[PDB]
Amino acid sequence: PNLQMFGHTAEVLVARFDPSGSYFASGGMDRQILLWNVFDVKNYGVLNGCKGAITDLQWSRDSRVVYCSSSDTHLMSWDAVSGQKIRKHKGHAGVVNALDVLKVSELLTSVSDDCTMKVWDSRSKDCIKTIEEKYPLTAVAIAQQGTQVFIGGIDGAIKIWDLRNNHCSHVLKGHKDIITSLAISKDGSSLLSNSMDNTVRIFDVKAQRQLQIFEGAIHGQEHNLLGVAWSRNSRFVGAGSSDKNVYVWSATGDLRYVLPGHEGSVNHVDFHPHQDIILSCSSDRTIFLGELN
Amino acid sequence: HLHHGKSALLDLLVYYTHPDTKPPKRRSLRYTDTHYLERERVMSIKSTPLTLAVSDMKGKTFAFQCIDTPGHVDFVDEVAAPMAISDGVVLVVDVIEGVMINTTRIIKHAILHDMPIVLVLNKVDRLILELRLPPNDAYHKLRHVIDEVNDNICQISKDLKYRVSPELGNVCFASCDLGYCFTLSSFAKLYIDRHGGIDVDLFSKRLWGDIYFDSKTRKFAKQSLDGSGVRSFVHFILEPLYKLHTLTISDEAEKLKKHLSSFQIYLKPKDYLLDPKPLLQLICASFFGFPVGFVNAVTRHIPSPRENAARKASQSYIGPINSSIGKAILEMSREESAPLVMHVTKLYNTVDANNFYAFARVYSGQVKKGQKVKVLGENYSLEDEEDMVVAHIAEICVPCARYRLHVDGAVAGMLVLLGGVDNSISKTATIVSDNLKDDPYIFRPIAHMSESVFKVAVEPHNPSELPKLLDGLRKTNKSYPLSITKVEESGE
């Protein structure tokens, strides 16, 4: 099958599976996160409260608590079993754009239009660290180790920071413009990155040079943050584009699947943790589950 | 007597125990009326039973097993029925009406069967607002009611084992509208818990009249008031009631805050900007708390089911006391071995008119589902066994007016609702277990305090449906003690 489920009122942004592979969550401009099943593809809770639009979901690695990143500074927290509020992580003085989580579900990183990175504990309700750069930040990724945090800004310079040192250790180079989504592999050994130059580049974690520049997935005037993912094997790379197409790569530098279906710009493509399924979201208010037999 | 505030007394308890329940706006609430006929008319009609977990001074919880009785003069039937089961009688009397008919008619009939009495002077608040008597002249109007109770006692017995008076503990001043019942002992506590150390007992003796208090000497006397001797009662109870029902009311809301802060009652500022009667209710329920007095005034005078077993078995049981059943009653045996003894008086309609629950006191042992049971009648004797009939106990349940508590095993001491045992029964009908030692005896058929008298003929409007009417007339005889059917020679 394919399954193009409808439900949201307005532009949807982010849609992700549990780490387990038993649910979706989705939510964009609706101010409504809508949970789903995978295997009778039905809705669940209408997580209501966020007074800004959602920009990023992420399941806790317990598969119970959910975290948002509203446009009104809040980062909310939700008990996916019951569906009640837990907290309002009040901090930033602007619009949050990305979130990331660890193994230990306890630490979270967010990224504002205040040019401020901030690490959060799920127990304090306050910031543990505050890394002020200069130009409004956009994408962030934290490693599996719980050590390296990658920041993506407007300079095209993916900076790398550790939790012990807090020094500008390294800076990725050769990306001319804008970053819309970082993504660390299931190894902890390589990033993915969507630039506004349409060069969906991979980078190294440890020597730190490029690997493979992919090219063929356009951003334009919309200025949405488009996403990228690593497949459960780390064989395939799934980048969406404003051309209504989900450009899946071969990770060897070869375009295999280029499946259309959406009527509007695509945002955050994902992969299921085990069985080969693709979550693809788009302003359109629609979502697909593209499979491979 | 009618509308004296019986059904509303229990409601006052209910409210404190069942948090969800709220008063309908138009009309009072009358928990324990239930029947839609009892609500169109508004008068209670069929006596209903309750049980609830009521607390006491200090805190001890007992399980009351109350029974609202119809106060209309014509259903005295359904006063007497449970009289042959209960361990005592609580009275309710209106401090404005006084002691009308049914109050005598019952007091008299109650002492005959050695029922110890507990007075509850209801609607006192009313005599402060409706009548607006001054506090001293109201005292006389109270005392007067208590006396007149006793003038109906004196006629039936000159004994001073009974004698209803607040000095002792029998009498309870309460208004079931505003939510407060107190005895003299309870009012005392109030002062005492707020002011160091004296006995409750050495206080409450002196609070009743023909006694006075000198604020100068701080001591009591029978001395006729020299100057400003008031009357202990009116000094320590009424006049600091009277104030309440004129502080709340008269919108001196600045004062109330300072005074109610003394007692550490803290309201929200919305509540003063509220409404007279339902502000009152809110204050009077925050100051006099739970109706503790009335609890303490029952558990001290109405005896526990064991103690009364001795006396109650003598006047009701026909047979000998020396027998094994006569003995098992006296000790209130709660074993398997013991013979099972009930005593059914009233049957209750259920939510559809089809069936009848039974209401019997379990006098001995245990009752459980599916037991074989010899259900005796009235005309029974050791000679003929034509009255007795075997039957199976379908459901045992504990009553609470509207809801019911499904129980597996009954026990001696309790009142119960039985399922299944109907068809043999019409009016009184003792139950007794089948497998027994010989000669099971009956319980005395209730003494109704009014003959039937009024007569009415009943033919069906269509004669083809005469069976159903006949089936119906049997069902009345079940749920209406004094009714009697009697087919005429003609066909009526």
């Binding site: - | 160091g196 150390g197 004296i198 006995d199 007992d201 050495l202």
Partner: protein
């Protein structure tokens, strides 16, 4: 505080008190206190030997008291 105890039913009756130091006394109960200080008349000791010495009117302290009994029902 100061709950005046229920010793009304013991007034003008014989008693068998026990006190601290395993020492005990018989007497007619005359009066009692908030703190349970007691007034006994016709006070007789019960020594560890068992030798019973008549004393008279006596005021036992509250603190000391362990308990208070009745000889005859």
């Amino acid at each position: 505080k100061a709950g005046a105890p229920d010793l009304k039913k013991y007034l003008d009756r014989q008693v068998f008190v026990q006190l601290n130091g395993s020492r005990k006394v018989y007497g007619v109960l005359r009066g009692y206190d908030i703190f349970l200080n007691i007034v006994l008349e016709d006070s007789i000791e019960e020594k560890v030997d068992g030798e019973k010495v008549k004393i008279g009117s006596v005021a036992i302290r509250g603190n000391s008291v362990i308990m208070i009994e009745t000889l005859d029902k």
